[PDB]
Structure 1
Amino acid sequence: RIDSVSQLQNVAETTKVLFDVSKETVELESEAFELKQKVELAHEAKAVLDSW
């Protein structure tokens, strides 16, 4: 039981970093979403001038 508890020694100090940096790496990409809007716009513009 000592060994089973001592497996949980430095979990909290590291998982408080895990939680934060994990949700940041999830959720810091709406910039890329709004970049995708401009990318598909320029994609359509290149396509239609290719048609012209």
Structure 2
Amino acid sequence: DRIDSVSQLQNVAETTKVLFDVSKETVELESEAFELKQKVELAHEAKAVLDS
């Protein structure tokens, strides 16, 4: 029974560290995307005023 618990934990220890890195890394890229959003926004507004 004890062996069963242990075997799970071995594989976990490495692979979980991968996810740890991965999650924060994606979030960083997504931060940079906000600057893109601002490009989208200003242009949309400009077309609208001009249409009026």
- The TM-score range, normalised by the shorter chain, is 0.7 to 0.9
TM-score with structure 2 length normalisation? 0.83
Between Structure 1 and Structure 2, which shows a larger proportion of helix residues?
Answer: 2
Structure 1 alignment gaps of length 5 or more: none
Alignment RMSD? 1.1
Aligned length: 51
Deviation sequence 1:6-31 (CA, Å, 0-9, x none):
11121121111110011111221122
Structure 2 alignment gaps of length 5 or more: none
Question: Post-superposition, which runs of at least 4 consecutive aligned residues in structure 1 deviate over 2 A?
Answer: none
TM-score with structure 1 length normalisation? 0.83
Deviation sequence 1:22-45 (CA, Å, 0-9, x none):
111122112210111111100100
